[PDB]
Ligand binder design. Structure first.
Ligand SMILES: CNC(=O)[C@H](CCCCNC(C)=O)NC(C)=O
Length: 129
């Protein structure tokens, strides 16, 4: 894509420690699956294209971008060490939306719907086995 968008967050790195846990499996099979198919997921399914959206300040404001396409690939590629690393990426995605956009805005209402669902599912994250 455009040189004015940053490289997306990495989804592979042989230097990073990785493991599968039952909590990470739940984050893929239950949490990400649930959020991904929601009516309001689409703005979150890939990195923000600030060029296409005509938002040239987006990567000046948001210095820790994150999206669910990145999270999906990180889960599928077993990139994470633990559930906390994955939960933080979801938390980062939601907070970026709330920092960059205004309380009334369509994208904020969309994020809030996804976040409500996320919280329902994380409250049920299984005991680590
Ligand atoms: C051109 N503007 C849009 O398309 C809007 C606003 C997008 C803001 C950037 N994305 C995020 C996730 O913060 N997207 C809608 C309203 O769904």
């Amino acid at each position: 894509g455009s040189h004015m968008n940053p490289p997306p967050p990495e989804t592979s790195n042989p230097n990073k420690p990785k493991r599968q846990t039952n909590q990470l499996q739940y984050l893929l099979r239950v949490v990400l699956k649930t959020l991904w198919k929601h009516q309001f997921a689409w703005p979150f399914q890939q990195p923000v294209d600030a060029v296409k959206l005509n938002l040239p300040d987006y990567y000046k404001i948001i210095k820790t971008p994150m999206d669910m396409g990145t999270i999906k690939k990180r889960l599928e590629n077993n990139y994470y060490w633990n559930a906390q690393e994955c939960i933080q990426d979801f938390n980062t995605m939601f907070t970026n939306c709330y920092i960059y956009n205004k309380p009334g805005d369509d994208i904020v209402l969309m994020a809030e719907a996804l976040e409500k669902l996320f919280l329902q599912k994380i409250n049920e994250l299984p005991t680590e086995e």
